[PDB]
Amino acid sequence: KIEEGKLVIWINGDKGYNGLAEVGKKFEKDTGIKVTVEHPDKLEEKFPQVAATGDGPDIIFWAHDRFGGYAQSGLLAEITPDKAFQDKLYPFTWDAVRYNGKLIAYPIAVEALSLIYNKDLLPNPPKTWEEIPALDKELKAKGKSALMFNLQEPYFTWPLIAADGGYAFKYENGKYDIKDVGVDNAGAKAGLTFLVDLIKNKHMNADTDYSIAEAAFNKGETAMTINGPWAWSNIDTSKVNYGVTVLPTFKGQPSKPFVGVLSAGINAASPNKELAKEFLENYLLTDEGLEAVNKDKPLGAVALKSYEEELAKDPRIAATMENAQKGEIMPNIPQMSAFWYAVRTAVINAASGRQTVDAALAAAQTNAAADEEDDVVIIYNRVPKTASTSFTNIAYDLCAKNRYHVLHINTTKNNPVMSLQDQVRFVKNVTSWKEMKPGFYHGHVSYLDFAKFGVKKKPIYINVIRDPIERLVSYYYFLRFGDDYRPGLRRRKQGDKKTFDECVAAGGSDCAPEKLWLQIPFFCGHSSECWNVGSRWALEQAKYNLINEYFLVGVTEELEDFIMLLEAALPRFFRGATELYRTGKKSHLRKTTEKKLPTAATIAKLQQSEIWKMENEFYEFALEQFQFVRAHAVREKDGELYILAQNFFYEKIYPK
Amino acid sequence: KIEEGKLVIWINGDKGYNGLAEVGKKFEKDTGIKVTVEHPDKLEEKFPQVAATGDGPDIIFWAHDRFGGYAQSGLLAEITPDKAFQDKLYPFTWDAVRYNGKLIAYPIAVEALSLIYNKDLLPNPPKTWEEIPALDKELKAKGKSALMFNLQEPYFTWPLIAADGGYAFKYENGKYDIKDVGVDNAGAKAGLTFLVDLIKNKHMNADTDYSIAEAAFNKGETAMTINGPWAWSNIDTSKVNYGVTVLPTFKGQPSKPFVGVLSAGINAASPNKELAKEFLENYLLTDEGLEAVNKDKPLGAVALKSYEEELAKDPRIAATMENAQKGEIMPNIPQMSAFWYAVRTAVINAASGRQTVDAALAAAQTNAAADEEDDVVIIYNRVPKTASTSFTNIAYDLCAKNRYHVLHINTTKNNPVMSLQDQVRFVKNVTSWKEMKPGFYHGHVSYLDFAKFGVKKKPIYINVIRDPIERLVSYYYFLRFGDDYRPGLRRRKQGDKKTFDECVAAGGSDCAPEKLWLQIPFFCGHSSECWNVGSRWALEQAKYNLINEYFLVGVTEELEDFIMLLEAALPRFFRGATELYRTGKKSHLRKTTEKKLPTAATIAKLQQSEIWKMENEFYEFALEQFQFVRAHAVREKDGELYILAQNFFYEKIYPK
Amino acid sequence: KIEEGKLVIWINGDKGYNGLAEVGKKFEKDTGIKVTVEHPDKLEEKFPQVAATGDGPDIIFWAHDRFGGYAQSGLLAEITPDKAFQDKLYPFTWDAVRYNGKLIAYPIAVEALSLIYNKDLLPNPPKTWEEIPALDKELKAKGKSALMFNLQEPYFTWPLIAADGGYAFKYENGKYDIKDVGVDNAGAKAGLTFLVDLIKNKHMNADTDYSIAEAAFNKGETAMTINGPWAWSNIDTSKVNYGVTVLPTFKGQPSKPFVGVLSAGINAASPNKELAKEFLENYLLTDEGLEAVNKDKPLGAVALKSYEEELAKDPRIAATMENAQKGEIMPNIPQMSAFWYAVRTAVINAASGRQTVDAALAAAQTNAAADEEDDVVIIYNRVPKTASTSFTNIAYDLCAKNRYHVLHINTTKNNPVMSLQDQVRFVKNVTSWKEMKPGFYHGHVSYLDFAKFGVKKKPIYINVIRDPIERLVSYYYFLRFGDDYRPGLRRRKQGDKKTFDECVAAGGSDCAPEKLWLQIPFFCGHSSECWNVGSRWALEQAKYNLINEYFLVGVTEELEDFIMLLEAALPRFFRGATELYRTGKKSHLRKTTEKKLPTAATIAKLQQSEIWKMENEFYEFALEQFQFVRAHAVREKDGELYILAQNFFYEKIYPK
Ligand SMILES: OC[C@H]1O[C@H](O[C@H]2[C@H](O)[C@@H](O)[C@@H](O)O[C@@H]2CO)[C@H](O)[C@@H](O)[C@@H]1O
Ligand SMILES: OC[C@H]1O[C@H](O[C@H]2[C@H](O)[C@@H](O)[C@@H](O)O[C@@H]2CO)[C@H](O)[C@@H](O)[C@@H]1O
């Protein structure tokens, strides 16, 4: 409960919160109002929650980039400083805290990342990134490391990714507004690739975080590091002779760090909006106020003109502004949250090798399109003997880390058709079982249309089918020789020497033409007509459902390409699926132990059947559709497939 | 407003809340904090509401089974007892209050239902249920009754339903989790059936509740009763010589009562989470604390080891544990809420005869699939002369009790096609008119696709059609002889002696082939093409809409089977519809007063028309589809149809 | 935070809030509880917001009409007056504050609009509206005006609109409930038309609001005005000799003002529900309480019997009741909110000429069907050279005032097919970009099915196509002579003298039959089959998507009729589009500078192509469908088209 009468302030732990407390103490001694400063973990995430329920701190401190979302969600109150106060702060800092014309926070300081090197180890810091690998080889030979910085927060990695071309909602002006994100273009790739190489050649270590980097550098174990003004305080204490300079260039271009402005917003639910205003305007935003804070951990270029003129003479601050200017001021639009998450995940995954750079960024471009939700559900009504085991298994292996559930649907005697009441039961489970979302449901069930049931959000359908004949042949020898997944269990007809070709020639049951009729009914659905072997109507309904209801249908013999596309369009589920497939062993699961290729004549015989022609028309339809999707989705280079970067943006947006 | 400084506790009225108050008083005398204990009605339902808005009690008392949902909804705060405290309570009781690894409540006591008989009336209590009918005959002859207990709460009935096979999310373990509900299998039916028979043979009375049972037994009017430890307190006061023993077996199997653990959770919005912890750990969960409570109304087997060793010597407690062990500890997963409602409604309806046991449980299986919502809307765009009056009337008769609305859509001159603007008007009404939900809208309107209008949740469509010719013949004589619904009103052509056959032979207007074109356009929709008599495209669109958009389409001559299926798939609307149809009189409403079967030659003539062929193809398509749904939905036994029990469950769920 | 211990009351600023304060002061002197009365702007809108979050005033004052919605949303607490109190207030006033059987507010006074004239200027006030124009001519010649009243609130205009036939949920009774709105019938039109004429003939001024009317009349500048009892207070101060009489009749019928009852409801979140009850029952609803208030600004006919008997002797109050009785008591059902907004917007737009009366009311009927939401999104995937520029431009010009966004979708090289990953990106943007809603997205993109992506709410699709050949011919000469939109930019083939006919005869590329294949794929979508020139399947999918997914598809040569329909079905977007089209100049944008009609023989040649036949079948299908929609949507009169009024309502609603 936001208590009235006192003030609760939240500020990140890397900042000088102890000094901030002193300003709180001064405030108590002059007004009698107690001021408590706290520094929670995941501050930028805790606030929007604890606050969305009329609770939380009175004043929230954070870079301006996230305040936009807080504003759009009505968690921030509008600040009303009179022009007398507004005039003592730099005009461009007020812009950082302006959302929809209103001022939603008080700016405090300008933060920008700089290169921080060890004078004793590296007399002359490197001007470019390209020269850091050679340097590390020399420094390694002396028991040292060249560079070390937080590879966990995209904040520290972004300067490089953006260097040659990456961006996020470039600041534009005009009668109209524009929307264009750019994390999957050449530049961004060239940048992240360079960083991934640095890890491959062991120049850097993928899981080095803020602390390991700080400790390493502050112990003179590594010549350089990348950090903000707040880090100077601890470096001073380590008697390390350091320097704060411009960031290394990449491809002849400067590193463009996303520049942020530390800001203080007032909680819209705060019953002390006034006391909050008094503290921030008459106490914190004064020379003595900022000094108390800055003495704890440097703020950088304060927004307060009177105190900046002083701090500006600090070489380190000059280095800050130099880098700051080489880059850009972060936007404060709501989209920013999705942007950071997308980029955060891409770097981490690219750095650990879980994803290639192409796959990592293609996914981030997708993930940046909206704030990630848990509301998604995938239904994969697998068709027997189509490599469904291999696939469904990729989901099982990725589900724990990717944070989603996998569930197998088991139907009595493996009947593809559920009763009407069971359909209702199934749909109700899938749409309401919140704890299973996001979820991946798979099973031997023909398509079931969720629309008829009045659901809010339909699930996403995907599938995999293979040539009609080959799947049958596969099911044939399967029943007689088992698989290599669970080799122990002898299948129902183990030890029948009758070959497929033999069965055809002798007109056996398991090789009858009507056994080809399977993939069509699985898509056609739970309709009577669907199960009339050879129905033309069912063949049309099958194609319509495949086109209208299915997200993507791949073919057994092209499983890899299928996974690649899914990893681009549905990263929450298949992020890292390609690498897993390409190097996991569990890639070609449940192979049939013994098989015997059909006869050129045995096939030509099956191909005289109406059932075959139909099931074949269907397969072709689906295959053409997959090849089409792949073709409009990727580009080839040296036999390698790459995900085309986003090819659309919004322009002429009105009003602004 | 959850006031800070004091404590508000909620506990059910059957428990010893007065004794709990004494513990509160002790707490006030040692800390100065006032403690108010209250016992509201529908406690388990009030909490989740009053609490979902940051209000309500500080501490909520209830069996552990519902705390799971409270947890998932963030209404409960995590309890932090140190192992010093955790060790003084039985380990299995802490498991009951564990949800998602966290401890969400303090366990207090173990409750289980036992058979409570009158030593003076029934010296030797019956060992099985099967012997209770004979016993009642003997006891009735002496002015007494054999057994009486609450038939309103499924809690008391469940022991019997579960005896031979019923269950709800059986507790399993392994690398994976499982989900399987079982309230519609043989066992559950055999159990509820037995109970329904006991009411049919007047051994028990369907609307006997907790009070009638307690009063009856405590007045020695009935030899037995089923209740929990809390009931002993009032029995002691009635000078009735009673005994607490094992529950009667059914089919050689023991009654498995759902075992619950009385638990105390702390409100997540409570500003006194600490005072709450102090009260529960140092005051209530102590020998003197539980004793104060237990002296008011027995708690059962307390979770506190030190005090259990004492109470355990009580024969009654031994009987409690005996029954407890014969059964199972209730799960605490969110699904539990839906489970209880489904079972509560099935018993009540089966017991009053509103539903047969099959229909009652088939519906509960459906209703257990998700928490009931009011967001559902059914649109029944009735086709003239297809028994729509009979049907729509079943909705009108069931709507009050089943809690939903029925509304008739009236269109100027009964035009099946609404204007584009009216479609928008209609859709807006149906999707936003919250107070009419759930709702049943019916009227002479052709299919209208809600998808095109950007709605969140589409409505559910159902319909009923009949043979093309017979419906026309029906409409023919209708216009001339009226119906028996409103016999007074003479219809537009009353007193035309021209028979149907006569009209055909003379090529009259009302019997023209083009008048057969009606059921097709009604499904095809509001598209121009639909209304071009004899359009092939319209015949295809009709089938597609029937398959893709309609929940279920029955045929006039099979109205009963149609109702049976709807009562299984949509119980909120049609619960009890079968019984109503089978025995209400208002079953064959609006019959046409006088009719004259067409001529074998008059029909053969209509059947030469393209319009007939098409409309006939449609009817056949729909009929085959209904027969198919019915076939995959029911099983026959002695000419009787039964709803197949659920044939699917989830396995290999990962992670756990 | 609704503070406990005091009382916060909200009342509209036109009422006597200062007098109400005096009652608050009396309450403080007898109980020590401070009472603060405030009068915010947009009170009826502020409450439901500030209150929906457990905050706001303790007591809310407003006419009973909106309290229904407040109730349905649980913002009001039930009032519990004992029959001793209930009996001292008129029974019909308690009905006004009864929602769903419960009493949700205390009634205070009955308000009704009356005609207020200047005795000195207009000795004998006009009995009918029809005689006011002549009167103004006489009064204008003397430097005066005849009538002036608030034309901004539909409250003041409604008496006239309802006079001859307009209504809103007429109060009915019976075993069943009824729902029927009537703002687009003859009467309502006849009424608003009369008012619009008064503005056309400059008898009144469209943007005259409450203040201008009050000032004008109170300065004797205008002979009459329409207002409530609250206005008498200021008129008395202006030494104007005024009289309060019956409202002028229209078409021989009396003006039926919507009668409202000023009511005081208690905030459901209020922690002082008792103090609130004490103040309202023992202080405000007493002779001395109402007198204090009434002395500030007359309340009208108080609900308190004892004090009404006094005030009832006031001629002015008699005039109030006379008008009140000629009209009806406003309903208090939730629908009322939507009703007022719809009517408020129609009057304003009709009065400014932005909409004709027909268009204004047709739209209000549509807008009254549900509370307006911002959640709507329109996607207009424009086809090249179909007048899309003219149309998309109407959106741009109307978006600022109509409060919605317009965005152009730009695809690399104008490719109609997005990649699978881009489709995901696009859909994610459109469904989650909250700040762009409502929105209008337009661009060269073929249909994209949002269903496959598991979205909550699909967007609305509209399009415009034209004859296959003429569009091609248009695209032909476009490339060679440019357009008049951006004449400067010379198009890719500027200065080719080859005519269309010439190109055909010489079998050129840009005039090839396969270039006709465009409108079909645009509707068929992102499927491979769609892009196989001449595919029969694609032609069927195109028709299905046009019928199943598109809201409305118009044809280039009938753009006006298309706009008219959209202005009726989607007023939020196209309100005023017709007038803009009919009189804006920017109506036929981007015309091709030079063209040359094809040859009767050149056409007959193209018409031999399979591609033409197909694309032609499609166009015809779409054209027939548009003509059909228009036909069932409008009526013609003197060559003029009018939107048919709503032709459906709900009857036999059960239960009541
Ligand atoms: O990298 C993601 C993260 O970057 C920024 O956070 C910075 C912050 O601005 C600095 O003041 C300092 O605290 O380092 C942080 C990185 O760990 C964005 O401000 C933040 O929104 C974003 O999630
Ligand atoms: O029967 C439905 C109901 O059963 C249980 O409630 C029990 C409770 O556990 C006992 O302590 C005692 O109060 O009798 C109640 C039955 O009236 C479940 O705990 C409850 O959730 C469920 O709705």
Ligand SMILES: OC[C@H]1O[C@H](O[C@H]2[C@H](O)[C@@H](O)[C@@H](O)O[C@@H]2CO)[C@H](O)[C@@H](O)[C@@H]1O
């Ligand atoms: O015209 C729309 C508006 O009308 C009514 O508001 C009246 C109110 O009832 C009177 O007491 C006085 O304040 O004039 C108002 C008109 O400006 C409805 O009560 C209100 O809900 C509606 O929006």
